[PDB]
Design a protein around this ligand. Structure first.
Ligand SMILES: Cc1cc2nc3c(=O)[nH]c(=O)nc-3n(C[C@H](O)[C@H](O)[C@H](O)COP(=O)(O)O)c2cc1C
Ligand SMILES: Nc1nc2c(ncn2[C@@H]2O[C@H](COP(=O)(O)OP(=O)(O)O)[C@@H](O)[C@H]2O)c(=O)[nH]1
Lengths: 460, 176
């Protein structure tokens, strides 16, 4: 096993194992946190929905994924228990995989060759060959594989230790219903000499009949497929509920923290729920991170599976497309957090700011002139020098709105004609006092950044 | 329970030092895993303390997902590879300003990682080709003062040198 291919088997293992633990962790929260809190009646139905939100929808979303990953591993388990009734020396190889690796080795083959199944799977059967092995006979086996036809030859093979033995070897393809070759069956009949006449004729019939049983006992069974990207590439586009969860999970964490401080009964109640040994000593709040942590760790896993998957591997075409779809999901979720917060801020402003003395009806949550959707940036208490009027400003990406504790103060100051504490608009010069130096830093840095963004975009 | 969060650039060794600390062994290349939220209990002066360990790996390039881990954080671990200078620059340019913004009352350590590669001849060769030199502790201790970090620590998840010490000093910083 090459170090590269060994890492691949390890990262594919990581994907499924961590998925098992993740789906289980989702179900733990529902069992010992969500359902108890729903009955506790310390939170209203709305308050519970503000915390766990579509947790249930995330579980069904990943179970469908988990079952798909399990079926693939189950194929090798159901097959092994089926081909266990055949106590003969045989291996099964996958031509569609690089260098035609052994995807299955019988128990009898391992006893004869003195090899373990872990030292064999994923390698070409050429390791059985040695010094006295007739290279001319070996090329007869190669041709039959390239020609996709059966063959039966006799050649010297060696064990793990080096014990010599003649091998009455029979090879035959395993075609599907469509007619294409998908697998190869290799039956070994160990001996001590090169069998001839009646001894050979009998042996040839035996191994050929053996291969016929293997082809039938393993037929109509969807064979173990050594790839995992095909599933991920088709399952990840359905991870939409993650966009919804993470966008609203922040309000939920702040809801619990609030309920925790202003109610000592609530804090102790939740802590007792976390005393479940299944929690490994972790609080409820940390479990909320797991859905966000899972999507961000999907590209990390897939990327490592991909970088240990060769170009000529049929999984490379899928893993590459899956990693693209995985990274899209994170971005959509990442932006989903930004969009939900933005809407929450703007809708709050829409029904709290009175717009009088204005020509057009100002809709905050709408489209700007050249920047698209309007974005809230900063807002804080602002005192006007030489007047000391209690003002309050809402900074956006396109303009600055000055209000008063909300009734509008003046005409909405656009940022394509604003300058940078001292803030300058065309001729008019505004002098505004900040509450602190750090807040004066926050305003200046954000106003200048938003102003320059407007200008450069307008200069196109 | 003390919540400790590990932050820093990608591939600086955040996940490894977490795994190597909790599992007492450096992650094999053939058996690689992620780091779920883990809790360990160490003994300092006869007093048991419980650490809440969080891994922010995979979030570095997502600005709205990163701060989700930040609430209720008791101590941060701002990480940089002593071999990677760009990870050392993002300390004062990104990570320390970011945790100061979200958690201004939360103390943080300056963690230099992968210190076992600082003497490695093969690694210095690659850094020499880009006119770069591995970050000496004297350099990093200067950044620790300038950014008002509690202190500076070095560790190798591979050698386990000063690995235990990092999380020990992390606890002491959260008891201030
Ligand atoms: C299913 C199967 C079983 C095989 N079993 C043996 C075997 O037992 N002994 C052997 O020498 N070659 C066996 N081979 C052939 C080798 O795997 C390999 O294809 C052959 O030695 C040609 O090697 P080459 O491509 O490097 O020239 C088997 C091939 C297949 C497809
Ligand atoms: N020599 C050495 N290598 C390390 C150490 N820590 C991490 N690495 C290497 O860094 C690579 C990825 O680091 P990782 O733990 O994923 O960093 P992260 O992405 O920030 O979490 C691994 O392949 C390790 O070989 C260390 O202490 N010593």
């Amino acid at each position: 096993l090459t170090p590269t291919e060994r890492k691949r088997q390890g990262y594919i293992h990581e994907l499924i194992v961590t998925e098992e633990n993740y789906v289980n962790d989702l179900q733990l929260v529902t069992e010992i946190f969500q359902k108890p809190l729903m009955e506790s009646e310390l939170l209203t139905e709305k308050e519970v929905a503000m915390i766990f939100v579509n947790w249930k929808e995330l579980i069904m979303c990943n179970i469908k994924l988990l079952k798909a990953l399990r079926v693939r591993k189950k194929m090798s388990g159901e097959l092994a228990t089926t081909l266990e009734r055949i106590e003969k020396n045989f291996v099964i190889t996958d031509p569609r995989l690089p260098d035609n690796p052994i995807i299955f080795a019988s128990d009898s083959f391992l006893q004869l060759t003195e090899y373990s199944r872990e030292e064999i799977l994923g390698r070409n059967c050429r390791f059985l060959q040695g010094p006295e092995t007739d290279r001319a006979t070996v090329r007869k086996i190669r041709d039959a594989i390239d020609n996709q036809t059966e063959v039966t030859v006799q050649l010297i093979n060696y064990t793990k230790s080096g014990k010599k033995f003649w091998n009455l070897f029979h090879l035959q393809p395993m075609r599907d219903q469509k007619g294409d070759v998908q697998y190869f069956i290799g039956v070994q009949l160990d001996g001590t000499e090169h069998v001839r006449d009646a001894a050979e004729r009998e042996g040839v019939m035996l191994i050929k009949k053996t291969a016929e049983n293997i082809d039938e006992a393993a037929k109509e069974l969807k064979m173990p497929v050594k790839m995992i990207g095909d599933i991920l590439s088709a399952q990840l586009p359905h991870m939409q509920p993650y966009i919804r969860f993470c966008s609203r999970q922040l309000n939920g964490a702040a809801l619990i923290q609030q309920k925790t401080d202003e109610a000592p009964d609530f804090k102790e109640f939740v802590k007792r729920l976390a005393m479940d040994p299944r929690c490994k000593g972790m609080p409820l709040s940390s479990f909320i991170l797991k859905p966000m942590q899972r999507v961000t760790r999907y590209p990390l896993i897939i990327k490592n599976i991909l970088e240990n998957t060769p170009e000529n591997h049929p999984d490379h075409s899928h893993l590459k497309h899956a990693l693209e779809k995985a990274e899209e999901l994170c971005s959509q979720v990442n932006e989903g957090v930004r969009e939900k917060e933005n809407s929450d801020r703007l809708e709050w402003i829409q029904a709290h700011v009175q717009c009088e003395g204005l020509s057009e009806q100002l809709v905050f949550n709408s489209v700007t002139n050249c920047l698209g959707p309007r974005k809230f940036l900063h807002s804080g208490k602002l005192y006007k020098a030489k007047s000391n009027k209690e003002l309050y400003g809402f900074l956006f990406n396109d303009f600055l709105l000055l209000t008063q504790i909300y009734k509008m103060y003046k005409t909405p100051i656009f940022l394509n004609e604003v300058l940078v504490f001292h803030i300058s608009h065309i001729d008019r010069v505004y002098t505004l006092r900040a509450e602190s130096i750090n807040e004066r830093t926050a305003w200046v840095q954000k106003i200048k950044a938003a102003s320059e963004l407007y200008i450069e975009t307008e200069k196109k | 329970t003390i919540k400790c969060v590990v932050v820093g650039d990608g591939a600086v060794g955040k996940t490894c030092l977490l795994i190597s600390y909790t599992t007492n062994k450096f992650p094999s290349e053939y058996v690689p895993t992620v780091f779920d939220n883990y809790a360990v209990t160490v003994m300092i002066g006869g007093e048991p303390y419980t650490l809440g360990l969080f891994d922010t790996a995979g979030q570095e390039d997502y600005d709205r997902l990163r701060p989700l881990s930040y609430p209720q954080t008791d101590v941060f671990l701002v990480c940089f590879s002593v071999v990677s200078p760009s990870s050392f620059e993002n300390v004062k340019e990104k990570w320390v300003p970011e945790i100061t913004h979200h958690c201004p009352k939360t103390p943080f350590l300056l963690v230099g990682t992968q210190i076992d590669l600082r003497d490695d001849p093969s690694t210095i060769e690659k850094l020499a080709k880009n006119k770069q030199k591995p970050i000496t502790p004297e350099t990093a201790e200067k950044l620790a003062r300038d950014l008002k970090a509690v202190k500076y620590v070095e560790c190798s998840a591979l050698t386990q040198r000063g690995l235990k010490n990092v999380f020990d000093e992390a606890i002491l910083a959260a008891l201030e």
